[PDB]
Amino acid sequence: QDKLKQAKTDAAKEIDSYKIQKDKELKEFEQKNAGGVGELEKKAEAGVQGELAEIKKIAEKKKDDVVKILIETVIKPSAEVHINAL
Amino acid sequence: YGAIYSVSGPVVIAENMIGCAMYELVKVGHDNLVGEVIRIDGDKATIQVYEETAGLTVGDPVLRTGKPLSVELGPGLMETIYDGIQRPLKAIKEESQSIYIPRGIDTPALDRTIKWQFTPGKFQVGDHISGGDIYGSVFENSLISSHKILLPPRSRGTITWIAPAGEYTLDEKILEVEFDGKKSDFTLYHTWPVRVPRPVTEKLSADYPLLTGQRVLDALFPCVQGGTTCIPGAFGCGKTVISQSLSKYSNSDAIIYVGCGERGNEMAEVLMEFPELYTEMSGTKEPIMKRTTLVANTSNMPVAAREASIYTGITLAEYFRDQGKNVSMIADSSSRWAEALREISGRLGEMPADQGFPAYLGAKLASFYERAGKAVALGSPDRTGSVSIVAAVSPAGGDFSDPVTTATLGITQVFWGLDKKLAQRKHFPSINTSVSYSKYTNVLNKFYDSNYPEFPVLRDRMKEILSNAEELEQVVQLVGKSALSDSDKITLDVATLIKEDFLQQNGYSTYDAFCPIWKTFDMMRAFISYHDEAQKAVANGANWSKLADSTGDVKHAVSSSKFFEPSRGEKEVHGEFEKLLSTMQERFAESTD
Amino acid sequence: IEKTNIVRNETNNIDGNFKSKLKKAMLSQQITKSTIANKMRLKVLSAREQSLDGIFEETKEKLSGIANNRDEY
Amino acid sequence: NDYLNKDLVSGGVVVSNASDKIEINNTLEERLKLLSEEALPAIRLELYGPSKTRKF
Amino acid sequence: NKKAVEQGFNVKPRLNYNTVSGVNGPLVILEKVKFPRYNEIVNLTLPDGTVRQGQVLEIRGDRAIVQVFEGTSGIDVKKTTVEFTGESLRIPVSEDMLGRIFDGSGRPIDNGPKVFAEDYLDINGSPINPYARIYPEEMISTGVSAIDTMNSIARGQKIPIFSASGLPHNEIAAQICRQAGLVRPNFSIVFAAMGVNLETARFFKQDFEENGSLERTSLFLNLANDPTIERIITPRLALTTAEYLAYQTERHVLTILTDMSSYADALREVSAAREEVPGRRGYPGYMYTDLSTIYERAGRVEGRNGSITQIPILTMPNDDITHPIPDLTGYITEGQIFVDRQLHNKGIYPPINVLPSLSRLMKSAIGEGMTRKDHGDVSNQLYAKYAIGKDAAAMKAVVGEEALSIEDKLSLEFLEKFEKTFITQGAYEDRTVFESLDQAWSLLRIYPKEMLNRISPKILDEFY
Amino acid sequence: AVEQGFNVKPRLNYNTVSGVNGPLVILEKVKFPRYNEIVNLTLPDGTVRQGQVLEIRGDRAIVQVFEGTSGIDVKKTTVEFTGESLRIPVSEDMLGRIFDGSGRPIDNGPKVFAEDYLDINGSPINPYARIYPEEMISTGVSAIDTMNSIARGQKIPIFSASGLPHNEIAAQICRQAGLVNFSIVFAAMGVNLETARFFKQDFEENGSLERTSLFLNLANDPTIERIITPRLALTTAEYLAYQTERHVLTILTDMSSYADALREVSAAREEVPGRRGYPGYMYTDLSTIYERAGRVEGRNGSITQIPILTMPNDDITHPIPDLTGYITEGQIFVDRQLHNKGIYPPINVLPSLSRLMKSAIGEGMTRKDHGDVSNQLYAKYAIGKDAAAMKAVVGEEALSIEDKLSLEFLEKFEKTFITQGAYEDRTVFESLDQAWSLLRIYPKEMLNRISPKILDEFY
Ligand SMILES: Nc1ncnc2c1ncn2[C@@H]1O[C@H](COP(=O)(O)OP(=O)(O)O)[C@@H](O)[C@H]1O
Ligand SMILES: [Mg+2]
């Protein structure tokens, strides 16, 4: 019957409410994932701090050698006409 | 100030004008005709003027403004009519005392005599201010209250002086910014170049529907607030009336109705009817004209001014978006803009590309339609406006294979194609349900789930019914109706009912001038329920002819549901639709029994 | 008969809603996980750009010193 | 007579022809900018070891 | 009183340029021109003494590309003398133009005097300010049911007459002129023939003379023998006269522009003479604008009691709506009256196929105040049932008459008694819009009350 | 070691500008102009724009400005000749970044710390140094994998029309492109921001931003950078696939927009048009773009180029789809009729073709019956279309028994086999089994294009 079908659907709607609670729990899990990602953001930043620690160290070790090449090139006499002009 | 070297049609090559940039506004002739530089061939600089070139003589001076074609943004425009170069037509009429637009009249775009009540914003003296930040607001009119005054983009610095609350004209200083030791004086208005789009913080995905009011447009092929739209069709199909009804009854807060290559009597009809119409928004009955501005460029006006009208309208829409208002710009005919482009290109002598339309037409259309979109404005406080572009492409010869139509469909997201076979026999809206599509249904699924959950499934059922009955109509036109099964007969009858009653919406009757979202949903529910009930009754074994004879009353009640007044309110009419469905179910059950 | 069909239909809708929410929750976790990974990569690339620009900022100071010395300028 | 800005330019010249239409910014700042934009692979190879992924 | 006289009492010498650089097609190019204008109508004197008018079209430095309306033929470099008037083409207008027959270029061929000008107005005109316009809301009872009930012509409407070559469009246009009148209360006709036959021009002139309209009609006749370049200016001259008589004189004016197909053919010839864009079917890309500057001179304006109604008479080449002239004219104008070869062959007069016909200005200008309440619903229902009749006739042709349903049979009966009794009229029969609506209600009462789905329930109850 | 990088070459700033016409800027006096040279136009407003020298006269240089010529003065504009063709800075870390149309960062990140400067036009690969791909890609789409297979290293475009889900189909192919992980180089040429956001969101959700490079040239972006974006993306792909030995899948989208940009530049140059105004050398330009896909002998790594294309009016005969079919190998045809019927993907397998399927499909590579099953499906689908046309034109009863069976097969084929929901990821073997289930509709007798041994072993 139509009335009985609605009552049976209402009973299944309780499972839908539980499914909605599970959907809300999934949203809470997504918020927990975002919160965990926020903790992972600190973890990623901690991992990034390890890598870019070498970046500062690698620069200073070979900085003065690169400047010597850069300075010698900017000033180097480069006087040559176009090939076509000859 | 350079001279004139050639005047051929709407282009004016100006000699001895070294130093004029591309798209720089110039004043060609002694009457100071406004024009834009296209080419720069050395000293010469080809100019497309936005006025009639008759009477121009070789040697007439051409002044270089040094600025691009700039629209004037601020309080004032909301309820006015413009002329593409943004010359207020009302002010022109009062100043000239003539029914014709004078050549080279230089009336200010925004009235300076009016004093606007300015209320300073949250920014105070000494607080840093960036581009697009709201430092105040003015009372434009009853409907557009608190017309938020935006600091111009590309301008930043520290507020040294801000005017207190009071009444100010547009010439008076409102705010002073010091940047790198240089003081900048800002007023209630500011000019912006129409070619360069106004900056936004970040364009967002449009998710709220643009309620056109038309049943077919709202249900079958929905459009969002921030989505581009195209309405191709021959003359008399209904693109102009669809656009006008959309401007009248849309949920958009501001309307920028742009007339390019459209007859001036349509602009007169808008100017006459919109004040009579009233908007239920803002908590009180306020005239539609208080939230609609017109950029009118009649077909007989200068050819080159159609592009200026398009850009002016879209820039006004972008400004009202940056204020946070959900705007919907409506081009009268992007196809007429494209025809103007073709005329200018042919006058120049460029390569015809396809059908004579210049090779950059597709790119220009793509840029203009990409101006639209929901976006967060540039400065604090945070706000989220939108610009929908409902542009009515008008193909030449009624064939959707025109270059302008093809480029418009490539760039747009919604196709409200119009069939002339339905334009005739007065079946407006003449939306060709077959070719028409809307790619915003997926993003509108969220809104439908929020408000009307069964809207997408009912709409899909209606589309399936219409497509199946189109196939059956081809079959019956080929080999008669004797072969069709019973369920085929019900499909054909219900689809004919849908086309005659639901899809066919008279925009000039009291009842169907504006079918709201809830009424459209109820009508789809009624028609789909009628189809389902007939299908179930026939599957139970009842003969379709006898069932139709018995349920003619129910069919007439369903077909007459379009006469229900939306003015009666959602609660009253929805009760009427529920009673209609209950009586329909009882009648079908009685007929089956 | 009708009661069983209605209950099954409601149960199917319940599963679909949970599955749709699960997909959205999983994708949103992936979006944030990739964004943090993307931000970290742009954090070290920018630092290398800062490291590179640190050398160039010094050479401008060194070049100015050369110009001051009229012996070699 | 129009000399270069002391703050922005550290040295060098900006040679131009008689019409002053064709000029060559040979200032040390401009030459350092060209070197910075054109020697990035060499600077990267000197600062950091060659990428193990990039064969050939 | 009037200060326009003071500027009139000025004499301006005109430079006679014997320097003709060259000539090609209809374009004659001058050299060493001193400060050329952009539309200065010149007086080009032939070696034989013939004086042809021409207007410059493109003016490079010390050069002006004149096109002559009568044709280059006979133009010689050594002997031609071109004088620049210094002003664009200006028609000498007055209230005395009414009752005079003019040539294609406005020269009086009525064997009478030259028009005693009251003002000189540029033929190109100016766009009417849309803020100064008034939406035409005053219905004109043309007396023919197919145009009054199915469609509807307001006072400022510019509805043309789409027709083929052999159809009686001329007889319909003359019927409208002899019967046009406000539904709820005369029209000074301004007639512009462009490339029409001598028979057509004679028919129009005789109709006006016999109906008495010639006392208030100013013909601008451009026959087929007349030069094909002044077909461009003939509608401009007639529309400038109409704009004068309407706006600056407060006279309601019917402007009948016959053979706009001939006007557009002249336009395509002029464009092809140059290196213009080919548009579609060879017509210039600017054709729409040109036809706009023609048609959009109609309409009413604020504060001036005059009005201009334009009834252009088109000649579709193959009776095709998709052709550029009908397509552009439908896009610009405010409707159309579709004269049908199918109905003409069937023997119906007027042979108006109402389905392709339309009128934008029915929406307002029909309703409860202008006419009776039922008109809009009746027209919509009549359109729907006429289309159902045509579709059911096609279905009958395809699958025999037995397969048709009761609705299809009723719709065929409605189609027959609608084309035979409602559309059909005598050449001199004028029907009041109320009588036409009553006939329409008879045709709708063919149907049962249930099938009239486009009729509002209140109107249907009050009028069935 | 590239020690030649440490070298300064001063550049000639030309203030001699004239003839600024559309996308084209003309310099009156240039000292030894170089063809295909990059210039830097410094506007009077101060903003710089790169430009490419399209043609050189004795002292002239017709420059095309990528960012457009809007605002270019003839007096205060200075043009600086860089002295070399456009070289994008490429790197291994360049993966995972979003770029503009001209290879400029968009993700608010630093400029690419260049590992080498590679020319946009690349170099012409020795045909003797190429490898025939013969390595099928399990694209996960039934209508593709089963009937028009894609081999790793095959330039197979997706022919589509306006409004069709070509973006969705290409995003699906990119998301699920394992062999029977891929790096991705995505080039957006004039696509709308909605499409660009869809592609970026889908890549990020699938987890592709770790190994992808987007060159987004939106519709609002200048219309001449569509000429340069595919070349930048393709040389990035060439780097990533040949020098870093990765497997790159290039998804150049709106090649129709690229061809419109070409026509716009060609029209401004006032040269001999060709067909529909598109430049006569459009075949050469499209071949230069497309032919940068495949495998090389020494280096294991490929560019599985999939250039999405949009037919202006769903017409193959249009110059862009026609030349793309001429050069690019294969084609995936997205059908407006199928999309209107509601099928996803709306791939029409009659125009869809793959030249490398016959060699990358079957004989133990995927399964023994792949090629014969795909031939049978194509033949019976063509029979079904012809029978549907015949049943529409004439009476249904006039159709033969085979025609009626083929109509039933066509229904069950469009509605079940081609119809594939997004994220379904059908294996090639599962698609073959489903295709056989479709082929079991017919009696064994009329499966004529199936080899009898396979017919006995799989029916
Ligand atoms: N929704 C509608 N309701 C009633 N009439 C309509 C509707 N849409 C269009 N029309 C009719 O179509 C006619 C033609 O106007 P329209 O086709 O909109 O102009 P255009 O040719 O520019 O599209 C109008 O007279 C109007 O009466
Ligand atoms: Mg219109």
Side-chain angles (χ1 to χ4, degrees), chain D residues 11-15 17-18 21-22 24-28:
Chain D
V13 294
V14 180
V15 190
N17 64 337
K21 295 260 160 274
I22 309 185
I24 297 175
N25 195 329
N26 219 7
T27 61
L28 298 168

Side-chain angles (χ1 to χ4, degrees), chain B residues 214 235-241 428 505-508, chain E residues 359-360 363:
Chain B
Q214 309 292 277
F235 57 101
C237 285
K239 53 186 58 53
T240 296
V241 172
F428 308 106
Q505 166 173 335
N506 183 296
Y508 296 127
Chain E
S359 289
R360 281 91 160 98
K363 295 162 321 203

